[PDB]
C-alpha cells in the first residue's frame, strides 16, 4: 500500500491533494505534515501531492498481503510485540475474559 | 486593554492599607472575592503589615499554607484573599480572633474579639429576589446567597448569621434610632444613631447620623451599615467607639497621654 | 472584517471622523443568515463570552401559534408572501422576523376537530374516509356530550380563518429571528392584523 513519502526536497505527501507537484496549504490542528506550536495556530506549509511520480526521494510502502517468499531482513525477523493493553476492558477482551 | 489586569501598583493601592512607597513597585493585588478591591484587606497585609507575624510575603505564604488562618470559619490559603467589613479572622494556633472593623480614620483596625463573638457576623443585605419556584433569596454585602429568608427582611437591613451553619440568626431593620456604621466616604468608620433618611427617587438617598457626643453627619444610603437595635451595638466596637475627634482634641489627648506616662 | 462601530460615521454636524484605533474584535459583524425554505440546516457560530448562536440557513418547520384559541403546534412552512422591509426578501424566499409566511393548517384543523361540536358548517362534498368520523361523531356518554355542547356554545371562527382553512394554508408572522436562534416560530395572523396583511399582499400582487 502506498502510504506516502517525501519528494526531492523532503516535503511529505499530503493525502488529499490531487496533484503531481507541491502546494502551499494553510494547515491547522488535525492535519498531517504539521504540528501546531500553540493552540489555535495555523501555518502555511509546502506539501507534496499524493500522486506518485519519479521526483520522489523516498516512497513508503506497507505490506498488506504476504507472498510466497520472505525478504531476508523484513519478514523472517520477528520484532517483539510488547506493552500489552492497560484499560481493564481491553485486558478482559484480549485475554477473552467474562464478567467475573 | 485586552482582558483583565492582574497587577496593582503600590501607589495606586487603597490608601487605607497604609503601604509605604519605598518597599516596592507593586502592592498585593487582592484576588476576586466577597469584597471589593478598594474596600477589602488582603490577608498578606493583615498578617504582615498589621499583625507583624511575618516579615515578607514568603512567610505569609508559609503561614497560610500551614492552614492556620480561618476567615469566616473557613481555611483560606490565598494570601491575597480579600477580607472585608465584619469578616472574622480566626487563628487557632495562637488562639485569637479578629473582626475587620473600620476605625474612625477609615482604616481596618486590628480589633480582637472573644471566641464567642467569632461564631457570628453581621451582613447588610444588598437585594432580595424570588427565584426557582417561588423561593425567596437574599444577597448580602458579603456576596452570600441565603435561601428562605424571613419575609420581614428587606434591603438595607443587616442580618446576623452563624458562621458555622451560614444561616440567619437575627436581623435589624433599617429605621431611625438604630445604631449604624459608615462603610464609605468622608465619614467612613464613624458610628452613630440614624436620625433621618432623605429619599431622592432616581438618585441616591441620604441618611443623617448623630454620634454619642451629638456630632451630626450625613452620607449616602449605600454607605450606611446598621450595627444594632437602638443605640446599643450587636458587635464589639474598636478602641474608639466610632467617635471622630477633631485634630485639636486628638492633639490634646496625645499631649495628655505623653504627660501622664513616662 | 464587517464592522458595527459608529466611529466610521459622519458626525451629527456632518463633519468627518478620524479613527483613533483600528477595528476591534468586539465591533465585528457577520454575514447575514439568508434563511431559505428547505430541509433543516442550522450552523452554529461561537459568539462573545463563549456563548452559542444558531445561524439557521434552511428551515421548513416552525412552531407557530393560534393565539385566539391558544393552540400552538409544530407546522411546516410553505411559502413567504409579504416582507415589510424589502420585496426581494419575498422573491428569494428568506425567513426573517416579521415576515408573513404560509403555514399548514392540518395540526390546528385537527385540534379543532378535537374541539368540534359545532352545527353544520362546510360538509357538502364530504370525505367518506373511515376511522376519521370517530373524532367528529364517536360514541359518548351524556355528560361528555354536555361538555362538548357547552364548548360549542363558545366556538366562533372568523370567515377569513375559514377561507384559509379550506385552502390548507394559513397566514402567519415570524416572531423569532431564525438567523440568531435557529428557530422560525410565530403566530397565525388574526383579526385586523390579518385584514391589513391581506390588503398588503393583494395590493402587491
Amino acid at each position: 500500500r502506498i502510504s506516502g513519502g517525501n519528494d526531492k526536497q523532503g516535503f511529505p505527501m499530503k493525502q488529499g491533494v490531487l496533484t503531481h507537484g507541491r502546494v502551499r496549504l494553510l494547515l491547522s490542528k488535525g492535519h498531517s505534515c504539521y504540528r501546531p506550536r500553540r493552540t489555535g495556530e495555523r501555518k502555511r506549509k509546502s506539501v507534496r501531492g499524493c500522486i506518485v511520480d519519479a521526483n520522489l526521494s523516498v516512497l513508503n510502502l506497507v505490506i498488506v498481503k504476504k507472498g510466497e517468499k520472505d525478504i531476508p531482513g523484513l519478514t523472517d525477523t520477528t520484532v517483539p510485540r510488547r506493552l500489552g493493553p492497560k484499560r481493564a476492558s481491553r485486558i478482559r477482551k484480549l485475554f477473552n475474559l467474562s464478567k467475573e | 486593554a485586552r482582558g483583565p489586569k492582574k497587577h496593582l501598583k503600590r501607589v495606586a493601592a487603597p490608601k487605607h492599607w497604609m503601604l509605604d512607597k519605598l518597599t516596592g513597585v507593586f502592592a498585593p493585588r487582592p484576588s476576586t472575592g466577597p469584597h471589593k478591591l478598594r474596600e477589602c484587606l488582603p490577608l498578606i497585609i493583615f498578617l504582615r503589615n498589621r499583625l507583624k507575624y511575618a516579615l515578607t510575603g514568603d512567610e505569609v505564604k508559609k503561614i497560610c499554607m500551614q492552614r492556620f488562618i480561618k476567615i469566616d470559619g473557613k481555611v483560606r490559603t490565598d494570601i491575597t484573599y480579600p477580607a472585608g467589613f465584619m469578616d472574622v479572622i480566626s487563628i487557632d494556633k495562637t488562639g485569637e480572633n479578629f473582626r475587620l472593623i473600620y476605625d474612625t480614620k477609615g482604616r481596618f483596625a486590628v480589633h480582637r474579639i472573644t471566641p464567642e463573638e467569632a461564631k457570628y457576623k453581621l451582613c447588610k443585605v444588598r437585594k432580595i429576589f424570588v427565584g426557582t419556584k417561588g423561593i425567596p433569596h437574599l444577597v448580602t454585602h458579603d456576596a452570600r446567597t441565603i435561601r428562605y429568608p424571613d419575609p420581614l427582611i428587606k434591603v438595607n437591613d443587616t442580618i446576623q448569621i452563624d458562621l458555622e451553619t451560614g444561616k440567619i440568626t437575627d436581623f435589624i431593620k433599617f429605621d431611625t434610632g438604630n445604631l449604624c456604621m459608615v462603610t464609605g466616604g468622608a465619614n467612613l468608620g464613624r458610628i452613630g444613631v440614624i436620625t433621618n433618611r432623605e429619599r431622592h427617587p432616581g438618585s441616591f438617598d441620604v441618611v443623617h447620623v448623630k454620634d454619642a457626643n451629638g456630632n451630626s453627619f450625613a452620607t449616602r444610603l449605600s454607605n450606611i451599615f446598621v450595627i444594632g437595635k437602638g443605640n446599643k451595638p450587636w458587635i464589639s466596637l474598636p478602641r474608639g467607639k466610632g467617635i471622630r475627634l477633631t485634630i485639636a482634641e486628638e492633639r490634646d489627648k496625645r499631649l495628655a497621654a505623653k504627660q501622664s506616662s513616662g | 472584517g464587517i464592522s458595527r462601530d459608529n466611529w466610521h460615521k459622519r458626525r451629527k454636524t456632518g463633519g468627518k471622523r478620524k479613527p483613533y484605533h483600528k477595528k476591534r474584535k468586539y465591533e465585528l459583524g457577520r454575514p447575514a443568515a439568508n434563511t431559505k425554505i428547505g430541509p433543516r440546516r442550522i450552523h452554529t457560530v461561537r459568539v462573545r463570552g463563549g456563548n452559542k448562536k444558531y445561524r439557521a440557513l434552511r428551515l421548513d418547520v416552525g412552531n407557530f401559534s393560534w393565539g385566539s384559541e391558544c393552540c400552538t403546534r409544530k407546522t411546516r412552512i410553505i411559502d413567504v408572501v409579504y416582507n415589510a422591509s424589502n420585496n426581494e426578501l419575498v422573491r428569494t424566499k428568506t425567513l426573517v422576523k416579521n415576515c408573513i409566511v404560509l403555514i399548514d393548517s392540518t395540526p390546528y384543523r385537527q385540534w379543532y376537530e378535537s374541539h368540534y361540536a359545532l352545527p353544520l358548517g362546510r360538509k357538502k362534498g364530504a370525505k367518506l374516509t373511515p376511522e376519521e368520523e370517530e373524532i367528529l361523531n364517536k360514541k359518548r356518554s351524556k355528560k361528555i356530550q354536555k361538555k362538548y355542547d357547552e364548548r360549542k356554545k363558545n366556538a366562533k371562527i372568523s370567515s377569513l380563518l375559514e377561507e384559509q382553512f379550506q385552502q390548507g394554508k394559513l397566514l402567519a408572522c415570524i416572531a423569532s429571528r431564525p438567523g440568531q436562534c435557529g428557530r422560525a416560530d410565530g403566530y397565525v395572523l388574526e383579526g385586523k392584523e390579518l385584514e391589513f396583511y391581506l390588503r398588503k399582499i393583494k395590493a402587491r400582487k
Binding site: - | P201, G202 | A84, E190, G191, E193
Partner: protein, 151 residues
C-alpha cells in the same frame, strides 16, 4: 385618522387584540385595550397617551423606553422631523481669568411622543434620559410647558 400608515402592522406588542368575542354581546367596535405606564419621578401620564390610539415604540408612556439618568430642560426650536424635535439648551460658561461668563448653547434632538400635541416652537420641554433611540437621540420629552408668550 388611520394608524397603519407603514408597510408593517402597527400595534402595541403587549396588548393582545385577537381575543374571542360574543356575537350577541358585541355591536360595533367594543374596545381596544391600551397599554400605558406611569414613569417615575412624579411625572403624570398625559390624557392623550391613556385614551389615544397612536403607536410609538419610543414613547415614554406607551412604548418600550425607560427613563433613567438626567432630567433636563430646553426650548423647542425646530419641529421638522417625524416624532423628533430639536431643543436648545442655553447656559453660561465661566472663564476664570476674566471672572466673567459667555453665552453657549447645545442643541439636543429629543423624541416627542404623539401624546404631546400642538407643541409650539419656543415651549419649554422637560426631557428624560433614555437608551440611544437613534444616532443622535438619547432623550424623551416628558412634559411640555407652554411658553409665557402664548395664547
Amino acid at each position: 385618522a388611520d394608524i397603519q400608515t407603514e408597510r408593517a402592522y402597527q400595534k402595541q406588542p403587549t396588548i393582545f387584540q385577537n381575543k374571542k368575542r360574543v356575537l350577541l354581546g358585541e355591536t360595533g367596535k367594543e374596545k381596544l385595550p391600551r397599554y400605558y405606564k406611569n414613569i417615575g419621578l412624579g411625572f403624570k401620564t398625559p390624557k392623550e397617551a391613556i385614551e389615544g390610539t397612536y403607536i410609538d415604540k419610543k414613547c415614554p408612556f406607551t412604548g418600550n423606553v425607560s427613563i433613567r439618568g438626567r432630567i433636563l430642560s430646553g426650548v423647542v426650536t425646530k419641529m421638522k422631523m417625524q416624532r423628533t424635535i430639536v431643543i436648545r439648551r442655553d447656559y453660561l460658561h465661566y472663564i476664570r481669568k476674566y471672572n466673567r461668563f459667555e453665552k453657549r448653547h447645545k442643541n439636543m434632538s429629543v423624541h416627542l411622543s404623539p401624546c404631546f400635541r400642538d407643541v409650539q416652537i419656543g415651549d419649554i420641554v422637560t426631557v428624560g434620559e433614555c437608551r440611544p433611540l437613534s444616532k443622535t437621540v438619547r432623550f424623551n420629552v416628558l412634559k411640555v410647558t407652554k411658553a409665557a408668550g402664548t395664547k
